[PDB]
Write a protein that holds these residues in place. Structure first.
Motif, PDB file in Angstrom:
ATOM      1  N   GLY A  23      72.523 -52.755  14.192  1.00 17.26           N
ATOM      2  CA  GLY A  23      72.578 -51.374  14.611  1.00 17.26           C
ATOM      3  C   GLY A  23      73.858 -50.645  14.270  1.00 17.26           C
ATOM      4  N   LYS A  24      74.845 -51.321  13.691  1.00 14.06           N
ATOM      5  CA  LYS A  24      76.100 -50.685  13.317  1.00 14.06           C
ATOM      6  C   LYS A  24      76.115 -50.383  11.821  1.00 14.06           C
ATOM      7  CE  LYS A  24      78.897 -52.440  17.148  1.00 14.06           C
ATOM      8  NZ  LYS A  24      78.118 -53.621  17.636  1.00 14.06           N
ATOM      9  N   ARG A  25      77.054 -49.533  11.416  1.00 13.56           N
ATOM     10  CA  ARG A  25      77.131 -49.078  10.029  1.00 13.56           C
ATOM     11  C   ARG A  25      77.994 -50.051   9.242  1.00 13.56           C
ATOM     12  NH1 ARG A  25      79.600 -43.473  11.306  1.00 13.56           N
ATOM     13  NH2 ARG A  25      80.737 -44.988  12.603  1.00 13.56           N
ATOM     14  N   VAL A  26      77.373 -50.756   8.301  1.00 14.20           N
ATOM     15  CA  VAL A  26      78.041 -51.763   7.483  1.00 14.20           C
ATOM     16  C   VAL A  26      78.014 -51.300   6.034  1.00 14.20           C
ATOM     17  CG1 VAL A  26      78.079 -54.182   6.773  1.00 14.20           C
ATOM     18  CG2 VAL A  26      77.366 -53.562   9.100  1.00 14.20           C
ATOM     19  N   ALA A  42      85.897 -45.390   3.486  1.00 18.11           N
ATOM     20  CA  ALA A  42      84.881 -45.015   4.462  1.00 18.11           C
ATOM     21  C   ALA A  42      85.252 -45.497   5.857  1.00 18.11           C
ATOM     22  CB  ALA A  42      83.519 -45.575   4.045  1.00 18.11           C
ATOM     23  N   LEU A  43      85.820 -46.703   5.958  1.00 19.49           N
ATOM     24  CA  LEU A  43      86.238 -47.211   7.264  1.00 19.49           C
ATOM     25  C   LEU A  43      87.426 -46.430   7.791  1.00 19.49           C
ATOM     26  CD1 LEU A  43      85.826 -49.212   9.508  1.00 19.49           C
ATOM     27  CD2 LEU A  43      86.976 -50.970   8.151  1.00 19.49           C
ATOM     28  N   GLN A  44      88.386 -46.123   6.913  1.00 22.64           N
ATOM     29  CA  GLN A  44      89.542 -45.334   7.323  1.00 22.64           C
ATOM     30  C   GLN A  44      89.125 -43.960   7.838  1.00 22.64           C
ATOM     31  OE1 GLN A  44      91.639 -45.698   3.611  1.00 22.64           O
ATOM     32  NE2 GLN A  44      93.106 -47.169   4.462  1.00 22.64           N
ATOM     33  N   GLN A  45      88.078 -43.375   7.253  1.00 27.66           N
ATOM     34  CA  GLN A  45      87.568 -42.070   7.665  1.00 27.66           C
ATOM     35  C   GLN A  45      86.529 -42.166   8.774  1.00 27.66           C
ATOM     36  OE1 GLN A  45      89.002 -39.376   6.265  1.00 27.66           O
ATOM     37  NE2 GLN A  45      90.108 -40.566   4.710  1.00 27.66           N
ATOM     38  N   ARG A  46      86.274 -43.370   9.282  1.00 28.17           N
ATOM     39  CA  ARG A  46      85.318 -43.610  10.361  1.00 28.17           C
ATOM     40  C   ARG A  46      83.910 -43.121  10.019  1.00 28.17           C
ATOM     41  NH1 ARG A  46      86.925 -47.091  13.676  1.00 28.17           N
ATOM     42  NH2 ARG A  46      84.826 -47.502  12.845  1.00 28.17           N
ATOM     43  N   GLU A  47      83.502 -43.361   8.773  1.00 31.18           N
ATOM     44  CA  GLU A  47      82.134 -43.111   8.358  1.00 31.18           C
ATOM     45  C   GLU A  47      81.287 -44.372   8.424  1.00 31.18           C
ATOM     46  OE1 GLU A  47      83.089 -41.488   4.503  1.00 31.18           O
ATOM     47  OE2 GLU A  47      83.512 -39.514   5.349  1.00 31.18           O
ATOM     48  N   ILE A  48      81.914 -45.517   8.690  1.00 28.43           N
ATOM     49  CA  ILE A  48      81.241 -46.795   8.863  1.00 28.43           C
ATOM     50  C   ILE A  48      81.993 -47.563   9.941  1.00 28.43           C
ATOM     51  CG2 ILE A  48      80.423 -46.893   6.485  1.00 28.43           C
ATOM     52  CD1 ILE A  48      82.864 -48.915   6.133  1.00 28.43           C
ATOM     53  N   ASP A  49      81.416 -48.693  10.357  1.00 34.28           N
ATOM     54  CA  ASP A  49      81.992 -49.509  11.416  1.00 34.28           C
ATOM     55  C   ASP A  49      82.592 -50.825  10.937  1.00 34.28           C
ATOM     56  OD1 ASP A  49      81.155 -47.695  13.475  1.00 34.28           O
ATOM     57  OD2 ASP A  49      79.107 -48.356  13.008  1.00 34.28           O
ATOM     58  N   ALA A  50      82.120 -51.363   9.812  1.00 37.04           N
ATOM     59  CA  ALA A  50      82.576 -52.658   9.327  1.00 37.04           C
ATOM     60  C   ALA A  50      82.203 -52.785   7.857  1.00 37.04           C
ATOM     61  CB  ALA A  50      81.962 -53.814  10.124  1.00 37.04           C
ATOM     62  N   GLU A  86      69.554 -59.866   5.570  1.00 36.19           N
ATOM     63  CA  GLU A  86      68.921 -60.902   6.371  1.00 36.19           C
ATOM     64  C   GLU A  86      69.182 -60.736   7.861  1.00 36.19           C
ATOM     65  OE1 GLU A  86      70.609 -64.436   4.782  1.00 36.19           O
ATOM     66  OE2 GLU A  86      69.834 -64.092   2.760  1.00 36.19           O
ATOM     67  N   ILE A  87      70.110 -59.857   8.239  1.00 40.69           N
ATOM     68  CA  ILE A  87      70.508 -59.711   9.633  1.00 40.69           C
ATOM     69  C   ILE A  87      69.400 -59.016  10.416  1.00 40.69           C
ATOM     70  CG2 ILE A  87      72.216 -58.700  11.189  1.00 40.69           C
ATOM     71  CD1 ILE A  87      74.285 -58.959   9.018  1.00 40.69           C
ATOM     72  N   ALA A  88      69.080 -59.553  11.596  1.00 35.75           N
ATOM     73  CA  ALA A  88      67.983 -59.046  12.418  1.00 35.75           C
ATOM     74  C   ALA A  88      68.466 -58.874  13.853  1.00 35.75           C
ATOM     75  CB  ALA A  88      66.780 -59.993  12.367  1.00 35.75           C
ATOM     76  N   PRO A  89      68.365 -57.670  14.452  1.00 36.99           N
ATOM     77  CA  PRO A  89      67.922 -56.410  13.840  1.00 36.99           C
ATOM     78  C   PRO A  89      68.910 -55.931  12.771  1.00 36.99           C
ATOM     79  CG  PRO A  89      67.879 -56.302  16.252  1.00 36.99           C
ATOM     80  CD  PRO A  89      68.695 -57.489  15.875  1.00 36.99           C
ATOM     81  N   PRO A  90      68.452 -55.112  11.820  1.00 39.55           N
ATOM     82  CA  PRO A  90      69.322 -54.749  10.704  1.00 39.55           C
ATOM     83  C   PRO A  90      70.473 -53.884  11.145  1.00 39.55           C
ATOM     84  CG  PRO A  90      67.022 -54.506  10.090  1.00 39.55           C
ATOM     85  CD  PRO A  90      67.060 -54.698  11.584  1.00 39.55           C
ATOM     86  N   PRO A  91      71.617 -53.980  10.478  1.00 39.64           N
ATOM     87  CA  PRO A  91      72.608 -52.911  10.544  1.00 39.64           C
ATOM     88  C   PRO A  91      72.087 -51.687   9.817  1.00 39.64           C
ATOM     89  CG  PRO A  91      73.279 -54.537   8.934  1.00 39.64           C
ATOM     90  CD  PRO A  91      72.003 -55.053   9.541  1.00 39.64           C
ATOM     91  N   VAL A  92      72.770 -50.569  10.029  1.00 37.82           N
ATOM     92  CA  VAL A  92      72.649 -49.429   9.128  1.00 37.82           C
ATOM     93  C   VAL A  92      73.447 -49.781   7.886  1.00 37.82           C
ATOM     94  CG1 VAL A  92      73.185 -46.997   8.768  1.00 37.82           C
ATOM     95  CG2 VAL A  92      72.382 -47.804  11.011  1.00 37.82           C
ATOM     96  N   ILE A  93      72.799 -49.744   6.721  1.00 39.08           N
ATOM     97  CA  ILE A  93      73.437 -50.190   5.492  1.00 39.08           C
ATOM     98  C   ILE A  93      73.853 -48.978   4.678  1.00 39.08           C
ATOM     99  CG2 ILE A  93      73.231 -51.558   3.415  1.00 39.08           C
ATOM    100  CD1 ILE A  93      71.205 -53.332   4.942  1.00 39.08           C
ATOM    101  N   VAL A  94      75.149 -48.896   4.402  1.00 40.36           N
ATOM    102  CA  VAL A  94      75.750 -47.804   3.653  1.00 40.36           C
ATOM    103  C   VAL A  94      76.263 -48.415   2.362  1.00 40.36           C
ATOM    104  CG1 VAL A  94      77.586 -46.064   3.628  1.00 40.36           C
ATOM    105  CG2 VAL A  94      76.343 -46.568   5.774  1.00 40.36           C
ATOM    106  N   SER A  95      75.814 -47.910   1.218  1.00 31.09           N
ATOM    107  CA  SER A  95      76.248 -48.531  -0.027  1.00 31.09           C
ATOM    108  C   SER A  95      77.107 -47.573  -0.842  1.00 31.09           C
ATOM    109  CB  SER A  95      75.059 -49.035  -0.858  1.00 31.09           C
ATOM    110  OG  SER A  95      74.374 -47.977  -1.467  1.00 31.09           O
ATOM    111  N   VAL A  96      78.021 -48.166  -1.618  1.00 33.17           N
ATOM    112  CA  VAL A  96      79.010 -47.441  -2.400  1.00 33.17           C
ATOM    113  C   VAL A  96      79.185 -48.140  -3.743  1.00 33.17           C
ATOM    114  CG1 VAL A  96      80.236 -46.476  -0.408  1.00 33.17           C
ATOM    115  CG2 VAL A  96      80.876 -48.713  -1.334  1.00 33.17           C
TER     116      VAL A  96
END
Ligand SMILES: N[C@@H](CC(=O)O)C(=O)O
Length: 287
Positions: free
Chosen positions: A161-164, A197-205, A178-188
């Motif tokens: 449930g977090k932004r990865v 993106a992490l420095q700007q707090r657009e993702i969590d990890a 493979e993670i269940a439940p899925p994270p929110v997946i942000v690709s670059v």
């Protein structure tokens, strides 16, 4: 404030089956080096005739292939591995030309014969071996998690449930899928973009090779690496599928630097933030 070009929130997908990271082709086994120097030199005659080794990587991967802020020179662990191959071909490490590639372009550059080798943290997998060849393993990393020091994330299930953030074209995506439940997946496009993106707090990890993550921590000591080993990442030099001679030649270079102290020196130079240098990875040969 900067914004990485190409950031995509990926469509939600059901988790992939847990054995999607299985590697049952014994992918890390590669070709024995040539027995004689004459055989080796013949295998790289075309590179020698072109006057330089053409190496695929990028200049934004801290600790591996980047531009030094003090000297302005291209440097890092992968740059140095490539230079050792050039040393065996030419006598000195300094006849290299770089072709700048993203993670998603490593296989296609080899398929299209646009570089001689890719030295860009390239995990050896069964899937990739259907398309390109690889040297023996020159560095063994493992996928982990990068998070700010104030984050409660410490294990894989905390990513649900977090932004990865993940770079496109990487093994890291498959494992996050493979993670269940899925994270929110942000690709670059690249891992440096995940750091922004992490420095700007657009993702969590961020989740990828602990080696790559260590380079991001070096740039941002507010972050730390957490979690267990999520997936083995055995790096190989990527080579065109059919150039078996160059596979054997690069495997000769790797035999040289594992045994003459150079591998140890390169680990101590670039990766000591992860701990004391291990023994160099033991090569595996099919023949
Ligand atoms: N080593 C991983 C991650 C990366 O290279 O960015 C891969 O081959 O995809």
């Amino acid at each position: 404030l900067p914004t990485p070009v190409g950031m995509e929130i990926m469509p939600p997908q059901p988790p992939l089956p847990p054995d999607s990271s299985s590697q049952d082709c014994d992918p890390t086994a590669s070709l024995r080096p040539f027995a004689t120097k004459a055989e080796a030199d013949a295998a790289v005659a075309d590179i020698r005739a072109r006057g330089r080794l053409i190496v695929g990587l990028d200049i934004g991967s801290n600790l591996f292939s980047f531009r030094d802020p003090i000297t302005g020179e291209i440097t890092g662990f992968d740059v140095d591995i490539a230079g050792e191959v050039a040393r065996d071909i030419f006598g000195v490490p300094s006849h290299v030309e770089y072709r700048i590639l993203s993670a998603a372009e490593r296989v296609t550059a080899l398929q299209k014969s646009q570089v001689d080798i890719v030295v860009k943290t390239m995990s050896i997998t069964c899937e990739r071996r259907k398309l390109v060849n690889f040297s023996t393993v020159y560095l063994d990393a493992n996928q982990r998690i990068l998070a700010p020091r104030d984050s409660p994330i410490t294990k894989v299930s905390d990513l649900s449930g977090k932004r990865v953030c993940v770079a496109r074209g990487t093994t890291s995506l498959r494992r996050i899928r493979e993670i269940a439940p899925p994270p929110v997946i942000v690709s670059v496009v690249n891992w440096a973009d995940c750091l922004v993106a992490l420095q700007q707090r657009e993702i969590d990890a961020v989740s990828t090779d602990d080696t790559i993550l260590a380079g991001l921590v070096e740039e941002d000591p507010y972050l730390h690496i957490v979690g267990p080993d999520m997936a083995d990442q055995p790096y190989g030099v990527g080579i065109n599928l059919d150039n078996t001679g160059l596979v054997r030649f690069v495997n000769g270079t790797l035999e040289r630097i594992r045994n003459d102290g150079t591998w140890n020196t390169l680990y101590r130079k670039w990766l000591t933030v992860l701990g004391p240098a291990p023994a160099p990875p033991t090569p595996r040969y099919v023949d």
